[PDB]
Design a protein around this nucleic acid. Structure first.
Ligand SMILES: Nc1ncnc2c1ncn2[C@@H]1O[C@H](COP(=O)(O)OP(=O)(O)CP(=O)(O)O)[C@@H](O)[C@H]1O
Ligand SMILES: Nc1ncnc2c1ncn2[C@@H]1O[C@H](COP(=O)(O)OP(=O)(O)CP(=O)(O)O)[C@@H](O)[C@H]1O
Ligand SMILES: Nc1ncnc2c1ncn2[C@@H]1O[C@H](COP(=O)(O)OP(=O)(O)CP(=O)(O)O)[C@@H](O)[C@H]1O
Ligand SMILES: Nc1ncnc2c1ncn2[C@@H]1O[C@H](COP(=O)(O)OP(=O)(O)CP(=O)(O)O)[C@@H](O)[C@H]1O
Ligand SMILES: [Mg+2]
Ligand SMILES: [Mg+2]
Ligand SMILES: [Mg+2]
Ligand SMILES: [Mg+2]
Lengths: 319, 319, 319, 319
DNA sequence: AAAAAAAAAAAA
């Protein structure tokens, strides 16, 4: 069945960032297929998409409705296997006969034409039969490359709700998850989580870790791991004529090159991972870090001598 | 039955772009099979084809006529299954015994010979028996590759009505759809929708989204998402000696290469999707974008150095 | 009964191209089974075969003769079903007891042996009993592959009339059909229809379309759709050293390769359908277009560089 | 009764090829059952078998004798139906009570055991009662596979007359039929018919066609249809080192492969039917053409490159 | 007692 009861509508901490998605889903559960017919939720990794879909399915089940939960990739696989075993009909009929269809991680429809076709047929029959549909994705339907324009058009033609985790929400979720666990809401602690968690998964994790080995524990390891990577303020921001806070946030040939440098150094000497440099610079997607390192590697006239100097300087006074 | 009552002839906002299709259908409903015997509607994705066919079927039902609605692909599938189970006769007889046949998305007859044969027989028996036929498609019968010349000849030999959504129509439909939400009378909403919706599905969607989270909300996210992709006016139209409005509309080795460039940059650094670059350049079909990017990739003497320069310049002052 | 009264002998516009078929049929109706015993009409798609057979049947009915109209494929199906239900005798007897037998689209007897057998028996009993027989086909009995030599021999042993739609006939039919709609006597209209209709179905269609949305309407869309595909005169006929009129009509390694090229380009960049390229080149059967494109694809030494050049040139100055 | 009076002994043009059959039949009519007791006529398709049997029956009727004409297949069917309805006795008695039994197309007794049994009994009772029997077939009793040895033995034990249509006969029949149609015996005409008709059915047909649309008409269409298929002399007989007249008649790895090739090409590019290639090569039974094409398809080392070359060459300079 | 014709086509 794949509907794990742990995920419920009541467990879903609501804030300024997911209120829309939550309420839309809930209300759709009230009247199934009546309104908000094709619901398309999308958000960054670890935003609560799966929790939401799961909970919806659980409610539907609780009310006696036919339900199917399934990932896009798993849909593809299953369909292919039914193709091999030649019971594709039973597959189709099974899918079309639901009262609620939950398809998580839709972005995995890229490149699979036949899957998109099968799901297209299913989507249509369900929609026309006034059955409820709820899809979830890590990106806006537009960002869906390699997805037939018909499917994208359908996705956009319904309700398009994003889940954005701003500070005001992450705070709510942190406090509430702390409360859920027999945790006490200290400010040093909350204030800490705020600064070092972007999504709900990191929050849950960190929190469990506190519940296991105390806050003071993490504080130190993290502090050192991070400050031994804070060679930018010590060296790059003094040598190059620039402010630190400036070299953290983006926005020019005077501080940008200082950043490219910083990243390069972090990667070359400190042996920090791409993810760590990314996290440290407040950068996202860990893409501009790799491309920036390649950038500093390409420009290599006498900038190379400078590089070498800064490198030796880093090895000597960084470890 | 697959005739969802939500779709009605009265719900069909009529304008300069779909008046013909609408009126032809309606009048055919008045006298079934008498005139406009084979009606063949076709249009771009999200034009109202399905709504129209649906409504027709609903009227026919309302007047006591036998009706069948079905997609081409679903017709194929069903037929095949009746083949496996050997009740193909019942299938045929069922289809031939209608007073109105609605076949949506006909373009899906390509490559299916046996289906085309079955539907050929059905089409003929119905036509001769003076029963009404209405097909819908995303392309002109000519554009139907892999469809037996007999079928295409039949399609063209009736009434061939296209649905084109010009501005004067999209305006009507926008205003009228707004009326439903008590949201008309808004200048900013209308002028906005005009600029950012091509078909009725995008209109419906956007509008629902306004009804949910206000106009001001969308305005910002969209504005930024789009203007951070507006690196053409800032960089490509200044470096290359060309006007912006010119680099938007097509029409030469002086501004075309500027566009190819623009698209390439958008895809490489901004990480924008094909659909987004397409939407941004006012291009359609998102084909000339991919082929144009491949074009700039193929010509790679010293144009490569130039490319690199423009790329670094983009990474630095675009994020 | 399947004899739709709309089709009549009087409705059959006669010209240099169908006079023979028409008069033979008519005269045979005068004396049934007396002379012109087995009539075998054949022609290109949309030539009036069905109209003629229909009208014949209607006359026979009008005079009190037993009549059966039926397509070959439908004959096969029916026969098979009578086989399943074991009432094959009633089927046979029913068919043998007519005064006139009309079998449309005979070419569909290919591969069906048992059907050919059943129809063989019927044909014989009828012929011997001096009853009238009229068959229609899209090809000369010789071209009938997979049809038992006995049947073909019988087909050829009667009257073999073809219906060819030359210009002098299409003109007559166009003028007369224009008279059918009370819309008439336009030189631009007639001269237009002549140039863009090959069979009577296209004529009827186009004309209905004029009666609906005026001539000026079609003129433009068609003109552009066609001239944006007229990249041959602009590029292929200038680059390659050849005349345009020459590259339209066939007839050598100096202009043939220019054509292969032209078609290839049309298909690759303009995204024109096979049917559209065919129509544009004045080619028929849309076969030499596909085979020609495959031809240019196979020869791919440095002809490939040339190809690429011509392609880029086309994308740039064709859209 | 199924004895159409159109067929008479007087209408039977006699020549070197059917004189024997004719005279045997006639004389047997003189003395019924006295001599030439079991007459077994056989010939190629369209030789006059049915005409002869018919005429015999008509004479018998004219003289007051009991007669039955019937095809073998129709005998089988009838017998089976009498089996279902349980009036098989009346059937038997009806058949045994004739003075003359005419069974056309005997070869259709293959695989029908019970029929062969019934007809065996009938044959015996009639023969013993000194009643006349005349069977007709498209093949020599030996060639009758799936016919009980008793029946074949009986067939061979009587008079076995073949009807062969040599030139000297076809000429007679052509001239006489031309005289029948109020035709003039022009030489180009006769000489034409000789070259393009093998059996009397083709003769009748062609002639009717002349009587309808003149000789000059056919001449052209046929000439072109045939000469556009005459790509053998132009290409296959020049490339391969061989004579044309040689490549027409059979009789070795030097000209045979040239023929296999020729046929293959005709089928692949010219899109000619099996019957047309057969007719063109002077081949008979259209069997060696299919088997020869399969032959050239099977041998496909570098013979394939050669094939391709010849194919391109054919497409280019053959259309 | 003899014995009909035969669909479309995954991702990597
Ligand atoms: N708003 C919320 N309220 C309560 N719990 C939440 C929550 N958002 C996230 N969580 C918790 O975080 C965990 C991860 O959330 P979820 O599985 O939904 O991520 P996700 O599926 O949306 C991103 P991905 O699927 O790409 O990993 C869940 O176990 C869930 O309990
Ligand atoms: N003229 C009109 N009046 C009212 N509503 C309309 C309309 N045209 C389109 N719509 C709305 O737009 C939605 C989509 O339109 P439609 O059903 O015609 O899609 P479609 O089938 O034409 C595009 P596709 O080819 O992808 O199926 C419908 O739900 C319908 O309500
Ligand atoms: N000589 C004629 N006079 C009047 N109308 C004609 C005509 N020839 C063709 N038509 C019209 O063209 C239409 C198509 O003709 P028809 O039904 O005979 O097609 P067809 O059966 O001959 C070709 P196919 O069956 O292969 O599609 C008919 O509706 C008929 O009215
Ligand atoms: N020797 C002859 N004299 C006059 N007419 C002849 C003839 N031979 C053939 N015909 C004519 O040719 C037509 C076909 O001949 P016939 O009916 O005998 O075919 P058939 O039965 O011998 C071959 P099958 O039965 O296999 O089709 C007949 O209508 C007949 O009039
Ligand atoms: Mg998920
Ligand atoms: Mg549709
Ligand atoms: Mg027809
Ligand atoms: Mg015979």
């Amino acid at each position: 069945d794949f509907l794990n009861p742990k995920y419920t509508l009541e467990n879903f901490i609501v804030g300024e960032g997911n209120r829309l998605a939550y309420e839309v889903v809930k209300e759709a559960l009230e009247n199934l297929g009546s309104l908000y017919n094709p619901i398309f939720i999308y958000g960054s990794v670890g935003t609560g998409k799966t929790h939401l879909l799961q909970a919806a399915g659980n409610e539907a089940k609780k009310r006696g409705y036919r339900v199917i939960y399934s990932s896009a990739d798993d849909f593809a696989q299953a369909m292919v296997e039914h193709l091999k075993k030649g019971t594709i009909n039973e597959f189709r009929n099974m899918y079309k006969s639901v009262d609620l269809l939950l398809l998580d991680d839709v972005q995995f429809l890229s490149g699979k034409e036949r899957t998109q076709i099968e799901f297209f047929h299913i989507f249509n029959t369900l929609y026309l039969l006034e059955k409820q549909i709820i899809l979830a994705s890590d990106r806006h339907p537009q960002k869906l490359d390699g997805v037939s324009d018909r499917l994208v058009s359908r996705f956009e033609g319904g309700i398009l709700v994003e889940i954005e985790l701003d500070n005001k929400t992450r705070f709510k979720i942190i406090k509430e998850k702390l409360k859920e666990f027999n945790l006490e809401l200290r400010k040093e602690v909350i204030d800490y989580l705020l600064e070092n968690t972007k999504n709900v998964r990191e929050i849950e994790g960190k929190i469990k870790l506190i519940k296991l080995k105390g806050f003071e524990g993490l504080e130190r390891k993290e502090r050192k791991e991070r400050d031994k990577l804070m060679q930018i303020v010590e060296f790059v921001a003094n040598y190059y004529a620039v402010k630190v806070e400036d070299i953290l946030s983006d926005k020019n040939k005077r501080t940008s090159e200082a950043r490219k440098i910083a990243m390069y150094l972090c990667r070359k000497v400190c042996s920090a991972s791409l993810i760590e440099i990314a996290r440290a610079f407040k950068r996202k997607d860990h893409t501009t870090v790799i491309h920036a390192i390649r950038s500093v590697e390409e420009e290599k006239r006498k900038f190379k001598h400078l590089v070498g100097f800064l490198e030796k300087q880093a090895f000597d006074k960084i470890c």
